[PDB]
Write an enzyme that holds these catalytic residues in place. Structure first.
Site, PDB file in Angstrom:
ATOM      1  N   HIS A  12       0.808  -1.212   0.000  1.00 30.44           N
ATOM      2  CA  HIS A  12       0.000   0.000   0.000  1.00 30.44           C
ATOM      3  C   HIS A  12       0.848   1.272   0.000  1.00 30.44           C
ATOM      4  O   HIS A  12       0.218   2.300  -0.267  1.00 30.44           O
ATOM      5  CB  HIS A  12      -0.908   0.053   1.240  1.00 30.44           C
ATOM      6  CG  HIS A  12      -1.857  -1.079   1.324  1.00 30.44           C
ATOM      7  ND1 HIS A  12      -2.817  -1.249   0.333  1.00 30.44           N
ATOM      8  CD2 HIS A  12      -1.974  -2.087   2.212  1.00 30.44           C
ATOM      9  CE1 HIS A  12      -3.523  -2.342   0.627  1.00 30.44           C
ATOM     10  NE2 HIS A  12      -3.047  -2.875   1.746  1.00 30.44           N
ATOM     11  N   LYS A  41      -5.261  -9.695  -7.371  1.00 31.77           N
ATOM     12  CA  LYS A  41      -5.951  -9.124  -6.207  1.00 31.77           C
ATOM     13  C   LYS A  41      -7.000  -8.161  -6.746  1.00 31.77           C
ATOM     14  O   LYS A  41      -6.658  -7.360  -7.607  1.00 31.77           O
ATOM     15  CB  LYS A  41      -4.928  -8.433  -5.343  1.00 31.77           C
ATOM     16  CG  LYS A  41      -5.494  -7.927  -4.028  1.00 31.77           C
ATOM     17  CD  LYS A  41      -4.457  -7.280  -3.165  1.00 31.77           C
ATOM     18  CE  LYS A  41      -5.093  -6.657  -1.914  1.00 31.77           C
ATOM     19  NZ  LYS A  41      -4.059  -5.967  -1.121  1.00 31.77           N
ATOM     20  N   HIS A 119      -3.577  -3.485   7.676  1.00 29.31           N
ATOM     21  CA  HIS A 119      -4.580  -3.824   6.631  1.00 29.31           C
ATOM     22  C   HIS A 119      -5.228  -2.525   6.205  1.00 29.31           C
ATOM     23  O   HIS A 119      -5.486  -1.650   7.053  1.00 29.31           O
ATOM     24  CB  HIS A 119      -5.601  -4.844   7.179  1.00 29.31           C
ATOM     25  CG  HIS A 119      -6.988  -4.721   6.660  1.00 29.31           C
ATOM     26  ND1 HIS A 119      -7.416  -5.151   5.446  1.00 29.31           N
ATOM     27  CD2 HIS A 119      -8.106  -4.192   7.247  1.00 29.31           C
ATOM     28  CE1 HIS A 119      -8.690  -4.881   5.258  1.00 29.31           C
ATOM     29  NE2 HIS A 119      -9.166  -4.285   6.370  1.00 29.31           N
ATOM     30  N   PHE A 120      -5.438  -2.407   4.909  1.00 25.82           N
ATOM     31  CA  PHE A 120      -6.178  -1.257   4.383  1.00 25.82           C
ATOM     32  C   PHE A 120      -7.657  -1.631   4.257  1.00 25.82           C
ATOM     33  O   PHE A 120      -7.993  -2.546   3.499  1.00 25.82           O
ATOM     34  CB  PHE A 120      -5.587  -0.890   3.035  1.00 25.82           C
ATOM     35  CG  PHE A 120      -6.081   0.435   2.483  1.00 25.82           C
ATOM     36  CD1 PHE A 120      -7.316   0.589   1.891  1.00 25.82           C
ATOM     37  CD2 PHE A 120      -5.278   1.540   2.641  1.00 25.82           C
ATOM     38  CE1 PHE A 120      -7.770   1.819   1.508  1.00 25.82           C
ATOM     39  CE2 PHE A 120      -5.717   2.778   2.213  1.00 25.82           C
ATOM     40  CZ  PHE A 120      -6.951   2.878   1.675  1.00 25.82           C
ATOM     41  N   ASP A 121      -8.519  -0.887   4.958  1.00 27.88           N
ATOM     42  CA  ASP A 121      -9.931  -1.250   5.004  1.00 27.88           C
ATOM     43  C   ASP A 121     -10.779  -0.576   3.943  1.00 27.88           C
ATOM     44  O   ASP A 121     -11.635  -1.174   3.303  1.00 27.88           O
ATOM     45  CB  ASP A 121     -10.511  -0.997   6.403  1.00 27.88           C
ATOM     46  CG  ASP A 121     -11.646  -1.925   6.796  1.00 27.88           C
ATOM     47  OD1 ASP A 121     -11.503  -3.166   6.683  1.00 27.88           O
ATOM     48  OD2 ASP A 121     -12.689  -1.405   7.253  1.00 27.88           O
TER      49      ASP A 121
HETATM   50  N1  LIG Z   1      -3.585  -8.335  11.171  1.00 25.62           N
HETATM   51  C1  LIG Z   1      -4.637  -8.188  10.281  1.00 25.62           C
HETATM   52  N2  LIG Z   1      -4.433  -8.517   9.005  1.00 25.62           N
HETATM   53  C2  LIG Z   1      -5.516  -8.470   8.157  1.00 25.62           C
HETATM   54  C3  LIG Z   1      -6.741  -7.891   8.405  1.00 25.62           C
HETATM   55  N3  LIG Z   1      -7.580  -7.993   7.300  1.00 25.62           N
HETATM   56  C4  LIG Z   1      -6.803  -8.485   6.322  1.00 25.62           C
HETATM   57  N4  LIG Z   1      -5.544  -8.810   6.800  1.00 25.62           N
HETATM   58  C5  LIG Z   1      -4.381  -9.295   6.033  1.00 25.62           C
HETATM   59  C6  LIG Z   1      -4.591 -10.527   5.158  1.00 25.62           C
HETATM   60  C7  LIG Z   1      -3.590 -10.304   4.029  1.00 25.62           C
HETATM   61  O1  LIG Z   1      -2.288 -10.838   4.314  1.00 25.62           O
HETATM   62  C8  LIG Z   1      -3.534  -8.810   3.888  1.00 25.62           C
HETATM   63  C9  LIG Z   1      -4.360  -8.239   2.754  1.00 25.62           C
HETATM   64  O2  LIG Z   1      -4.018  -6.873   2.582  1.00 25.62           O
HETATM   65  P1  LIG Z   1      -5.095  -5.697   2.617  1.00 25.62           P
HETATM   66  O3  LIG Z   1      -5.264  -5.311   1.214  1.00 25.62           O
HETATM   67  O4  LIG Z   1      -4.404  -4.598   3.371  1.00 25.62           O
HETATM   68  O5  LIG Z   1      -6.343  -6.206   3.322  1.00 25.62           O
HETATM   69  O6  LIG Z   1      -4.073  -8.210   5.104  1.00 25.62           O
HETATM   70  C10 LIG Z   1      -6.922  -7.503   9.775  1.00 25.62           C
HETATM   71  O7  LIG Z   1      -7.983  -6.998  10.161  1.00 25.62           O
HETATM   72  N5  LIG Z   1      -5.839  -7.659  10.642  1.00 25.62           N
HETATM   73  N1  LIG Z   2      -8.618  -5.408   1.414  1.00 31.35           N
HETATM   74  C1  LIG Z   2      -8.712  -4.248   0.765  1.00 31.35           C
HETATM   75  N2  LIG Z   2      -9.842  -3.705   0.524  1.00 31.35           N
HETATM   76  C2  LIG Z   2      -9.773  -2.583  -0.218  1.00 31.35           C
HETATM   77  C3  LIG Z   2      -8.624  -1.895  -0.518  1.00 31.35           C
HETATM   78  N3  LIG Z   2      -8.931  -0.711  -1.246  1.00 31.35           N
HETATM   79  C4  LIG Z   2     -10.252  -0.614  -1.156  1.00 31.35           C
HETATM   80  N4  LIG Z   2     -10.789  -1.715  -0.549  1.00 31.35           N
HETATM   81  C5  LIG Z   2     -12.188  -2.085  -0.343  1.00 31.35           C
HETATM   82  C6  LIG Z   2     -13.064  -0.961   0.170  1.00 31.35           C
HETATM   83  C7  LIG Z   2     -14.416  -1.388  -0.367  1.00 31.35           C
HETATM   84  O1  LIG Z   2     -14.922  -2.366   0.553  1.00 31.35           O
HETATM   85  C8  LIG Z   2     -14.114  -2.126  -1.639  1.00 31.35           C
HETATM   86  C9  LIG Z   2     -14.399  -1.369  -2.912  1.00 31.35           C
HETATM   87  O2  LIG Z   2     -15.729  -0.897  -2.963  1.00 31.35           O
HETATM   88  P1  LIG Z   2     -16.357   0.112  -4.012  1.00 31.35           P
HETATM   89  O3  LIG Z   2     -15.396   1.235  -4.183  1.00 31.35           O
HETATM   90  O4  LIG Z   2     -17.707   0.514  -3.579  1.00 31.35           O
HETATM   91  O5  LIG Z   2     -16.461  -0.789  -5.234  1.00 31.35           O
HETATM   92  O6  LIG Z   2     -12.702  -2.385  -1.612  1.00 31.35           O
HETATM   93  C10 LIG Z   2      -7.347  -2.484  -0.269  1.00 31.35           C
HETATM   94  O7  LIG Z   2      -6.242  -2.076  -0.579  1.00 31.35           O
HETATM   95  N5  LIG Z   2      -7.511  -3.689   0.406  1.00 31.35           N
END
Ligand SMILES: Nc1nc2c(ncn2[C@H]2C[C@H](O)[C@@H](COP(=O)(O)O)O2)c(=O)[nH]1
Ligand SMILES: Nc1nc2c(ncn2[C@H]2C[C@H](O)[C@@H](COP(=O)(O)O)O2)c(=O)[nH]1
EC number: 4.6.1.18
Length: 124
Positions: A12, A41, A119-121
């Site tokens: 990220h 991804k 983690h990016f939410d």
């Molecule tokens: N520690 C932790 N890791 C998470 C969380 N949700 C997803 N992950 C981990 C699983 C994957 O290795 C990675 C996915 O990257 P991301 O795009 O940032 O969700 O993040 C969380 O809430 N906590």
């Molecule tokens: N795990 C993860 N979720 C992502 C990341 N970037 C954005 N999102 C999630 C946020 C939203 O739940 C979804 C995209 O939704 P929308 O923009 O409405 O199509 O993706 C990322 O880097 N990692």
């Protein structure tokens, strides 16, 4: 032995540029950060801010994560971000992404010593 903190930075962070300069940014960066080796991804956000500014979000607005966890934090300010997401064409292993530049708040989950994003939410 990649830590969750380090995996966050690889997936990220792009502090080297202030924004995505070209429409091919997501295709190049998703490949070069290793995010298409197991699968395409579907969505991945890059943040164009310093590392310290992003780590600091873990002391800003506490919000719920999309999955109900309580260790998510929203930036008080907007940040320069690049939304990368698969196009219609995209099909593993031939991944394809659309690049969208935006200025939005980020929401991350934090954990650890040090207490940093893992983690990016969402962006909002
Ligand atoms: N520690 C932790 N890791 C998470 C969380 N949700 C997803 N992950 C981990 C699983 C994957 O290795 C990675 C996915 O990257 P991301 O795009 O940032 O969700 O993040 C969380 O809430 N906590
Ligand atoms: N795990 C993860 N979720 C992502 C990341 N970037 C954005 N999102 C999630 C946020 C939203 O739940 C979804 C995209 O939704 P929308 O923009 O409405 O199509 O993706 C990322 O880097 N990692």
């Amino acid at each position: 032995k990649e830590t969750a903190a380090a995996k966050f930075e690889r997936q990220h962070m792009d502090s080297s540029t202030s924004a995505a300069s070209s429409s091919n940014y997501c295709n190049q960066m998703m490949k070069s950060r290793n995010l298409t080796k197991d699968r395409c991804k579907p969505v991945n956000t890059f943040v164009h801010e310093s590392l310290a500014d992003v780590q600091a979000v873990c002391s800003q607005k506490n919000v719920a994560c999309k999955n109900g966890q309580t260790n998510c934090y929203q930036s008080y300010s907007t940040m320069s971000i690049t939304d990368c997401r698969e196009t219609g064409s995209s099909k593993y292993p031939n991944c394809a992404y659309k690049t969208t530049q935006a200025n939005k708040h980020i929401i991350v989950a934090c954990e650890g010593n040090p207490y940093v994003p893992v983690h990016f939410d969402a962006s909002v």
